[PDB]
With several copies, the nearest count.
Chain A
Amino acid sequence: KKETIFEVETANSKQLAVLKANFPQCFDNGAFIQEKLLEIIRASEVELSKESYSLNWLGKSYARLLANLPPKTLLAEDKTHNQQEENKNSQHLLIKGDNLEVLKHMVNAYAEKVKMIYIDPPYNTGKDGFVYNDDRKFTPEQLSELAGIDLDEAKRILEFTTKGSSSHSAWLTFIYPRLYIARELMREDGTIFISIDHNEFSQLKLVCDEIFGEQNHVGDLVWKNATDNNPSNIAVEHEYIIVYTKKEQLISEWKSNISDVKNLLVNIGEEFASKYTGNELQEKYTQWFREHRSELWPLDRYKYIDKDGIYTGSQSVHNPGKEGYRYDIIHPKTKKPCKQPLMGYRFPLDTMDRLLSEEKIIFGDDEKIIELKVYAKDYKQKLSSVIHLDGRVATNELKELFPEMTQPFTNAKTIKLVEDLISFACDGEGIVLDFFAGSGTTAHTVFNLNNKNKTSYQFITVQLDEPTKDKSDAMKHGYNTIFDLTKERLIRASKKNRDQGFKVYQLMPDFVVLTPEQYDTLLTTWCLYDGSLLTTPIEDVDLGGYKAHLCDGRLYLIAPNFTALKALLQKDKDFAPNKVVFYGSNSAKQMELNEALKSYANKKELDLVVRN
């Protein structure tokens, strides 16, 4: 009934609590009993692993503490933005501030609700300006107890965290509590996709095992995204996407259903069951194709048909850049050897004969180089682990929204990548979270999918008000932080996508009478904290004075001078509050309220809480 938000935590506080609460048999008056937990494991037919390995880093216990620590900030709304015609009825959210603190506020209302996560965290190249920075000021004695480590070990860690470091340990201390929280927000079937490069791929993989468990590893994608012609040993032209899940609850297969032209060509392929002989099937299809050709983009080169469906021709028979396999192919009609590719074939003779059996080879009218049949039914049939998509288009996408700026953002991801991942992993519904917004690519992709593909996704994106580099394009154009640039990108991307809009929220410092802003800050903070989504409306209640607020059957009395107490007692419908939260700084009137509400709860219950 009496609560002060936000309570001290350690590196095992919450973990050690869950164990006592769920396994009281395994705890003695005293410490843990190994044999009792081992007895419960052997019973559920679970074997004992021979595994004994770890990636230890400097700041591991520190990272473990920050994961357990409660928020040290408050939450406010940007009411100027969220009252604009386009943005008021929106289900999409853009949050300002440190992602770790934003994720910690979200736990209470969003736990086990996120369908997909996509993040582009700092790669920690030797030139992205990555350093570990905290805005925390613990004493070595505080860290020693909370950690718990010794005073000298505690001193070593704070020396490290304030240094600030660009090392693997610095990067891991930073990443660990962000993924640890994000995992709590994701549904059991929910997926996390993480962009990374050679700098932290091994470290990322191992920390995800420590956070999700290796059995929940879906796989790793290589995004072959650029060309590099600088003289080196290896010409590095790819990047990585580590994918994990919350796996026993995950769908057996991922399939993209974003192409209406594929489905059309699949339907039209089958549909032509009436015509069987050829050229008659190719007579009837060509006639149809010549008319509908332009309505088929990007599948508009699929001019042929056979018993198995519509297909196109592929020049992928030759060996690229290298000499291949030399053999002869005899033309089925001219009975002469076919024109050989300048670099020979991609595949040996034995392979070529098997494709010629399955009639997967296209010949010219003459003995013209052969081609391969590529069917429309097959078009985006799988999520290959190697993605060939030139990330230069990010510049095109951004130059379109910001024609005034030469280079708006340093190294931005393409919509085309995020678009693809969402479409295979999801089925047009759920929350899509990006707590490393940057340019705002994820959010923009959600605007695009719901607009063209008619999907029902909600985006939640987080970005830190990190200053714009002095003298840069953003700075020159008046963009003081990266957040001001992100916000604007989402504003311009909304105008181009039927004005779906988005709401804005921002982290606030914590804290003798209140100011009005401070009053709005506690209200927004309390409603999220109590388990209400930031899209749930906070109805204003006027009990004589008053001025109360109701959110999901929870009544708030922050305002001072509460008399009026009989107005709340009278409700009449639709009013039915099962919880009463009122600001503690605003005794007998308080004792009377708890006394009256107990007498009003029969029949039939309405509780009470005295907050801060």
Chain B
Amino acid sequence: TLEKNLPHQKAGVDAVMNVFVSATPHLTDNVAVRLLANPELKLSEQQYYNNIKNVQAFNGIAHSKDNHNAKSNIIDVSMETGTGKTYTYIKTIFDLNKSFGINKFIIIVPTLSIKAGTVNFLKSDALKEHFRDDYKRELRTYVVESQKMPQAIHDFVEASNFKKYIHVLVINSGMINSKSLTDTYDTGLLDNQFNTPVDALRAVKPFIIIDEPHRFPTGKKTWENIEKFNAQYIIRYGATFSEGYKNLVYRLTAVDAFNDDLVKGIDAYIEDNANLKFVKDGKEATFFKLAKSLSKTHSAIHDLTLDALNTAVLSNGIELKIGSSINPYSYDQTLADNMMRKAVKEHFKLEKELLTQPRIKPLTLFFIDDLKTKFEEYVLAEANELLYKNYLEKTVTNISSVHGGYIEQEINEILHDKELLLSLDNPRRFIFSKWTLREGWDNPNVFQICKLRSSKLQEVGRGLRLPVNEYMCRVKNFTLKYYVDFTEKDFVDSLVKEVNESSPSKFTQELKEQIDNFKDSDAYSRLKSELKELWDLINQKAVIEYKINSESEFLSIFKSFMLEETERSYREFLDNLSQTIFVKHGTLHKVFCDIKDTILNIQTIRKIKSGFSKYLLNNSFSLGYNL
């Protein structure tokens, strides 16, 4: 279920859309290329300068030298982790398509996990249904994949404009940097002109989106390759701009996210010295030097051995250069067993709280590096003690020991099992994931992250999102419990500083811690006419009813408003209008036929909505039916 419409999201959509006021879409003379390439969206330097200044002013962004640049087609959007930046850039793609008919976009991602997560979301039925209702558009997705002439590129370049389809190329950094894109082929694309993938993509005149712009440093290779596309405009989205801004259009910070409770609060748990450095294979211990691959002891460090030497590579994937250390007390059996036991006890305290309420299915995520029978024991014990859906859920948890479960293929399997994990039909709630797979977790119902054999904002962000109820809908104030080592004591102080530093000021004292109107009053009076008697009236629900006995009668009410507001395809206009106001296609057409005006744009539709709503309030017959 896609959340519409979140104010912090709609604000970012509008902030990119406002940059293109008075922009003109210029079609090519070439009849063949017109069907495959994008229209050239041209607008003057002054126009573009003025459009940005007005956006910055409205959004409360300082019109400084570091925040704007009229000699740059790069537009910037800043949104913190767990605020829906992906949904926002996708909704903007649909808006640039609605207003200008831009139908070909390149989504540039820096990682395979972000590529897998972006594609999953783009292909999902809930997204498809959401955007087909609101725009009467279909998105065709072309994913550039390493084969272990790229088909995604051929198909994206070759795809026809002829009108319900938006075409989108999803590509990662590794593929942008591959020779596969620079090479010459026997095959020609774009009216048989280009034998190179980059020349074929450049000719499409694309609009490029950059996900996490801090992973594309402007002076470096990846960015220089993106420059080769001679893109119309580049829209960068992220929480980190380590090289500053180009044209900052929107900023939703980490303090705003935590403060306006758009994200879960944090409840940190610190579970309670030595260092084994890699010398030259000789390893120095400070709590004596040992030689060398076999199991590392050297202490009690459980379950860890050397795999490669030159740098030394450990059994969990930890690569040590000559000088790199590791605290051997991190791998202690008692310390983990303790961390795991504590998270289980805290989960059931939250489980009986959420599953006895509509119900919310909570999840606990454990992060392993590479004892296991204990977990079951602990769950079983806490279940038999705590003995009504959670009574039957505990009964199934006792009757079975499948309450727990466990690189590009592995992330895909996580994303696949997503709807399954949130289903109250299956008992699985505890998840064991290797640290290397962390990038593939962003599950709203994860209420506990437990780093077992271990930016703080990035790691908490995996469980920051607002959870969904049994009816798969976001709850309309929860907290994520985070479990850390004895090694991390400054955790809440270092995270509270990190959130503040990233962002007159804030941040909430409670969030991250250790565990016109006169018309409205007349209407409220119309319905109205210890536990107190006033409580019984203030809690009795009713439903609005409009007393208009004829469509011919309604027609005259909308006509009056239309004439009073004289100071301001046609088919696509009326369809978009009906869906917003809501009034009959025939009655809107009838008034417009009578009226001495002439249509047709999104600005006109937005004025009729805002205007007619006010008119409706200011005037008068209406009611309230007892519901």
Contacts and interface: CB of A to CB of B under 8 A. Distances in A.
Given A68-B162, A579-B129, A595 B187 contact: no
A250 interface: no
A188 B277 CA distance: 47
Interface size class of B (residues with CB under 8 A): 35 or more
B554 interface: yes
Contact of B125 (A69, A248, A531, A584): A531
A566 B545 CA distance: 11
A530 interface: yes
A497 B298 CA distance: 69
Contacts of A565: 543
A566 B627 CA distance: 6
A587 B195 contact: no
A580 to B, nearest CB: 11
A50 B195 CA distance: 11
B568 interface: no
B562 interface: no
B587 interface: yes
Contacts of A146: 162
Contact of A57 (B4, B145, B186): B186
Given A588-B548, A591-B582, A610-B579, A576 B187 contact: no
A179 interface: no
Interface string B457-474: 000000000000001110
A511 interface: no
Contacts of A609: 133, 579
A68 B551 contact: no
A594 interface: yes
A146 B164 CA distance: 15
A65 interface: yes
Most chain A Cβ neighbours within 10 Å, of B148, B186, B195: B186
Given A54-B192, A148-B34, A215-B147, A596 B578 contact: no
Given A50-B188, A53-B186, A68-B160, A569 B1 contact: no
A52 B583 contact: no
Interface in B550-601: 551, 554, 558, 578-579, 581-587
A518 B559 CA distance: 33
B32 interface: yes
B546 interface: yes
B534 interface: no
Contacts of A248: 145, 147-148
A108 B160 contact: no
B32 A149 contact: yes
B546 A592 contact: yes
A566 B151 contact: no
A64 interface: yes
B35 interface: yes
Interface in B168-202: 184-188, 192-193, 195
Contact of A54 (B128, B187, B554, B581): B187
B16 to A, nearest CB: 24
Interface residues of A, number: 60
Contact of A596 (B128, B473, B544, B547): B544
Contacts of B472: 578
B526 interface: no
A607 B579 CA distance: 11
Interface string A65-81: 10011100000000000
A69 B164 CA distance: 10
Interface stretch (A327-335, A437-445, A459-467, A597-605): A597-605
Contacts of A600: 541, 543, 627
Interface string B21-37: 00000000001101100
B544 A64 contact: no
A593 B558 CA distance: 18
Contacts of A569: 543, 627
A280 B148 CA distance: 53
B625 interface: yes
A58 interface: yes
Given A168-B186, A596-B544, A530 B585 contact: no
B302 interface: no
B148 A149 contact: no
B291 to A, nearest CB: 25
Interface string A467-507: 00000000000000000000000000000000000000000
Contacts, number: 124
A69 B163 CA distance: 9
A337 interface: no
Nearest to B542: A599
Contacts of B1: 578
Interface string B214-244: 0000000000000000000000000000000
Interface in B38-96: none
Contacts of B192: 50, 52, 54
Nearest to B626: A566
Contacts of A168: 186
B572 to A, nearest CB: 14
A570 B627 CA distance: 8
Contacts of B551: 587
Contact of B541 (A52, A584, A593, A601): A601
Given A148-B35, A569-B543, A52 B584 contact: no
B438 interface: no
Contact of B578 (A58, A170, A530, A584): A584
Nearest to B623: A592
B506 interface: no
A320 interface: no
A544 to B, nearest CB: 12
Nearest to B583: A587
Contact of A578 (B123, B128, B473): B473
Contacts of B554: 587-588
Most chain B Cβ neighbours within 10 Å, of A165, A212, A600: A600
Contact of B188 (A52, A69, A215): A52
Interface string B498-517: 00000000000000000000
B132 interface: yes
Contacts of A579: 129, 133
Contacts of B581: 591
A213 interface: yes
A167 interface: yes
Contacts of A589: 546
Contacts of A169: 186
A80 B176 CA distance: 57
A52 B128 contact: no
A225 interface: no
B543 A566 contact: yes
A316 interface: no
A245 to B, nearest CB: 12
Contacts of B188: 50, 52, 54
A590 interface: yes
A566 B195 contact: no
Given A54-B187, A587-B587, 15 more contacts: A50-B193, A54-B192, A108-B132, A149-B31, A159-B184, A169-B186, A530-B129, A531-B125, A566-B543, A585-B584, A592-B543, A599-B543, A599-B544, A600-B543, A607-B4
Interface of B: 1, 3-4, 31-32, 34-35, 123, 125, 128-129, 132-133, 138, 145, 147-148, 151, 154, 160, 162, 164-165, 184-188, 192-193, 195, 471-473, 541, 543-548, 551, 554, 558, 578-579, 581-587, 625, 627
Interface of A: 50, 52-54, 57-58, 64-65, 68-70, 107-108, 112, 146, 148-149, 156, 159-160, 165, 167-170, 212-213, 215-216, 247-248, 530-531, 565-566, 569-570, 576, 578-579, 584-585, 587-596, 599-601, 605, 607-610
14 contacts: A52-B186, A52-B192, A53-B185, A58-B186, A68-B165, A69-B162, A148-B34, A170-B186, A248-B147, A578-B1, A585-B584, A587-B558, A594-B582, A600-B543
Top-8 shortest CB links A-B: A52-B188, A53-B186, A213-B151, A588-B548, A588-B546, A169-B186, A148-B31, A68-B162
